[PDB]
Amino acid sequence: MAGILFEDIFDVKDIDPEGKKFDRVSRLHCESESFKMDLILDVNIQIYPVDLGDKFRLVIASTLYEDGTLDDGEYNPTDDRPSRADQFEYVMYGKVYRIEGDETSTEAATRLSAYVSYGGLLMRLQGDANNLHGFEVDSRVYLLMKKLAF
DSSP: OOOOOOEEEEEEEEEOOOOOTTEEEEEEEEEEESSSOEEEEEETTTTSSSOOOOOOEEEESSOOOOSSSTHHHSSOOOSSSTSOOOTTTTEEEOOOOOOOOOSSSSOOOOSSEEEEEEHHHHEEEEEOOHHTTTSSSSSSOOOOEEOOOO
């Protein structure tokens, strides 16, 4: 599907270039703006201007597109051409790996965690169970990004 249902802004908190397999890929640490998520990535950083980080908008508005809402014959246009992956700076598939969220024993971890591998990139995430919007192993594998829009 492309059936919504989540979008949020971030601010980079730290950058961690440990393992330069490619100079343009680094670990990052981020915090979301509209809500309360705590995030780690290992991701292409050439999207950012230089060293410093910047504010993103991650989206798990589902993408679609294994099938034929676009492979029908469109997806050639103004989704690209003068537009780009810029209306959606990046977009990819992956695998979520996760328990019930809890690993405390009894506090029933008030933030559901998530771990994601996506196109060879990685994330490590925490947020409230409803708020993370990814109870399933198969929801936030649908993954999309852009700059902030302000």
